Each structure stands twice: as C-alpha cells, then as structure tokens.
Amino acid sequence: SSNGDLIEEIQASSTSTDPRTFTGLSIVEDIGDVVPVTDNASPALPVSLTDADGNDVVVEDVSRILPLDLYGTYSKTIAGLGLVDNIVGRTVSSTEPALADTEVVTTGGHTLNAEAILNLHPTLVIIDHSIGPREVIDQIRAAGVATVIMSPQRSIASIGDDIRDIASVVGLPEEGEKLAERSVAEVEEASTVVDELTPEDPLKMVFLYAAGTGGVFFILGDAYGGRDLIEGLGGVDMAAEKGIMDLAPANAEALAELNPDVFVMMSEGLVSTGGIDGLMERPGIAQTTAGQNQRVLALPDGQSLAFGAQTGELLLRASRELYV
Ligand code: HEM
Numbered sequence: 604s605s606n607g608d609l610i611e612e613i614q615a616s617s618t619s620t621d622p623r624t625f626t627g628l629s630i631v632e633d634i635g636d637v638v639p640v641t642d643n644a645s646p647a648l649p650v651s652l653t654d655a656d657g658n659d660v661v662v663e664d665v666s667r668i669l670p671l672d673l674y675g676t677y678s679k680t681i682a683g684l685g686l687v688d689n690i691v692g693r694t695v696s697s698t699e700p701a702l703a704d705t706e707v708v709t710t711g712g713h714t715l716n717a718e719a720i721l722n723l724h725p726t727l728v729i730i731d732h733s734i735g736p737r738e739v740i741d742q743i744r745a746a747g748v749a750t751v752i753m754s755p756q757r758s759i760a761s762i763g764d765d766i767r768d769i770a771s772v773v774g775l776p777e778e779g780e781k782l783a784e785r786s787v788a789e790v791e792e793a794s795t796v797v798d799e800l801t802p803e804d805p806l807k808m809v810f811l812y813a814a815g816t817g818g819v820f821f822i823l824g825d826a827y828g829g830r831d832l833i834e835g836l837g838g839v840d841m842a843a844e845k846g847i848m849d850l851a852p853a854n855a856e857a858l859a860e861l862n863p864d865v866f867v868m869m870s871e872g873l874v875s876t877g878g879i880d881g882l883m884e885r886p887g888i889a890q891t892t893a894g895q896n897q898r899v900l901a902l903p904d905g906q907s908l909a910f911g912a913q914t915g916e917l918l919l920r921a922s923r924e925l926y927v
Pocket of ligand 1: 675695908
C-alpha cells in the first residue's frame with residue numbers, strides 16, 4: 604500500500620478521544636505530485652471519440668495538453684498516466700508542484716482566456732463545463748484545437764471510471780487501468796481506516812468556499828461534490844441534509860440552520876478571508892458549534908475537491924486531523 608506507513612501510524616495512535624472536544628484549525632499540507640504509473644507512456648494514437656457534449660473528436664497529437672477544470676483533477680490524472688511533461692498550461696486550480704512554473708490560462712479566478720490558450724499552441728484541450736465561458740471553449744475548437752469535453756461522475760465510487768475515461772482520450776488504456784485500480788484500492792483502504800476513527804454520532808460538516816473578504820462566501824452543494832468528501836471523512840454534509848444542489852450564500856440564517864460541527868475549507872481560500880480570525884468575523888460563523896469551537900479543517904485547495912488518484916491519501920490525512 605502506498606499509504607501503508609500512514610495507515611500504520613493512524614492505527615498505532617489513539618482515537619478514544621472525543622472529536623467534538625477538538626478546537627481550532629486543522630490544516631492538511633499539500634500532498635504533492637501524483638506518482639505516475641509509468642515512466643514510458645506511449646500514447647496509441649489516433650483516437651476517435653464522441654465527447655460528453657456530443658462532439659465527435661479525433662485526438663491525434665497529445666504533445667501539448669491543456670487539462671483544464673475547476674477542481675484540479677485532469678492535470679493530476681494526466682500526470683498519473685505518465686504525461687506530466689506534455690502539460691503546457693493550467694488553471695489556477697492545478698496547484699500541484701510539477702506545474703508551478705507552467706503558464707496559467709485563466710484570469711480573475713476561473714475565467715478562460717482564449718488568447719493565453721491559443722498562444723500556447725495546444726494540440727489537445729481536455730475540459731469540462733465546471734469552468735467557462737462556454738464561448739471561449741467554442742472559440743478554441745474553432746481555431747483548430749482538438750477539444751474534448753468530459754463530464755466526470757466525481758464520486759468516490761467512480762474515481763476509477765473517471766480515470767479510465769481520461770486515459771481513453773490520450774490513448775493510454777493500460778496506464779488508465781493501472782492508475783484506476785491503484786487509486787480505488789487506496790480509497791477503499793482509506794475508508795476502512797476512516798470507519799474505525801469515526802464517532803458513533805457523525806460530525807456535522809459543511810464545505811465553505813471563500814475567495815476574499817467580501818461576498819464570495821458560499822456553502823457548496825451537490826454540484827461541487829463536497830458531499831462525497833464529507834461522507835468520505837465520515838461526516839454528514841449539512842448542505843445535503845438541506846437539499847442545496849448548487850451553492851448557497853453562507854449568511855447568518857443559513858449558518859444557523861445548518862449548524863455544523865466542522866467547517867471544511869480550502870487553505871489558501873481561508874487565508875484569503877483573513878484566516879480563522881477573519882472567518883470568525885463573518886456574520887453567523889461564531890454562533891454555530893463549529894464557530895464556538897473555532898473548528899475548521901483546511902485542505903489544500905487544488906486537492907480538496909479534485910478527488911482522482913490522491914483521494915485516499917487526502918481522506919487519511921484529513922481524518923487524522925479530525926479524529927486523532
Ligand atoms: C469548488 C472548487 C474550486 C476550487 C478548487 C477553486 C480554487 C481556486 C484557487 C486555487 C484560486 C486562486 C487564489 C489566488 O488567485 O491566489 C481561486 C480563486 C478564485 N476563485 Fe475559486 N475555486 C473553486 C470554486 C469557485 C467558485 C464556485 C467561485 C465563485 C462562484 C470561485 C471564485 C473564485 C474567485 C473570484 C477567485 C479569485 C480570487 C483572487 O483574486 O485571488 N471559485 N479559486
């Protein structure tokens with residue numbers, strides 16, 4: 604097991620303690636680059652496919668890839684398959700160390716910039732509608748860039764299938780199968796450990812998204828996949844209990860209604876609202892159980908909702924902070 608040392612450490616450390624008595628910030632450090640399944644990936648090209656929007660695409664050259672999304676998944680999967688050196692641009696969400704010097708093709712957060720994309724002379728764009736504008740995606744295709752729209756399932760159960768889908772696009776089915784199986788083994792193993800750590804009465808959680816000290820401050824719902832993360836950590840997602848399907852402003856009324864025990868956040872996002880002290884100034888935060896315990900689990904932004912290959916490790920690291 605790639606997470607074997609971590610699992611052994613967790614099993615040796617005590618969890619008789621009541622996690623409802625823990626206070627303060629817990630921050631999970633960056634997990635780093637995905638370990639590739641091969642050092643000699645040899646894409647079997649060309650590939651013909653029909654993408655998630657119904658577009659027929661031929662992928663004939665994967666030398667210059669733009670793997671773009673909101674969550675940071677595709678760039679990590681591409682590296683896991685053996686093609687990290689082929690990535691020529693990224694969004695702000697693909698924060699993994701291997702891409703730190705790679706050109707960023709989004710502006711103002713997540714807005715696709717056509718000029719930045721086309722100036723990189725990509726041979727393949729892998730993207731989904733988690734980012735836009737849609738019109739920019741259309742412009743890139745119209746400029747002659749092979750563009751493949753994905754629609755990943757983004758559940759823990761589908762980590763392997765989402766990997767296999769990416770692998771098919773780039774003509775690496777064997778690497779896809781290896782990476783899928785490794786990643787699913789790691790998540791199931793993590794879950795066995797999480798189940799041993801969790802309290803009988805699960806912790807109530809919400810995923811709080813922040814960008815700055817103003818109104819970009821949301822409870823994330825079904826569409827963003829945080830339920831999958833929260834339940835993977837042994838929690839109950841209060842957004843799911845309330846039926847939030849997209850996102851909702853994290854105003855005083857919503858926070859009082861949801862009343863989580865833990866806020867799950869992204870670490871750079873938390874910094875952007877002034878850290879835990881800045882968070883505690885926001886209306887309604889301090890009045891929740893989580894606020895009263897200053898209880899925040901901050902996860903590396905570009906891994907937090909990426910799922911993919913490193914999900915198991917994320918769950919183990921995060922659960923250690925919740926329960927040990
Ligand atoms: C759910 C997954 C998401 C992830 C992983 C993510 C990640 C990030 C990251 C890593 C940054 C970079 C901060 C920086 O510029 O230094 C950022 C910025 C930003 N995000 Fe997101 N984001 C997500 C969702 C959203 C959503 C739903 C919105 C708005 C509805 C949003 C709006 C912004 C804005 C406005 C910025 C710019 C902040 C700045 O100038 O620094 N993001 N995001």
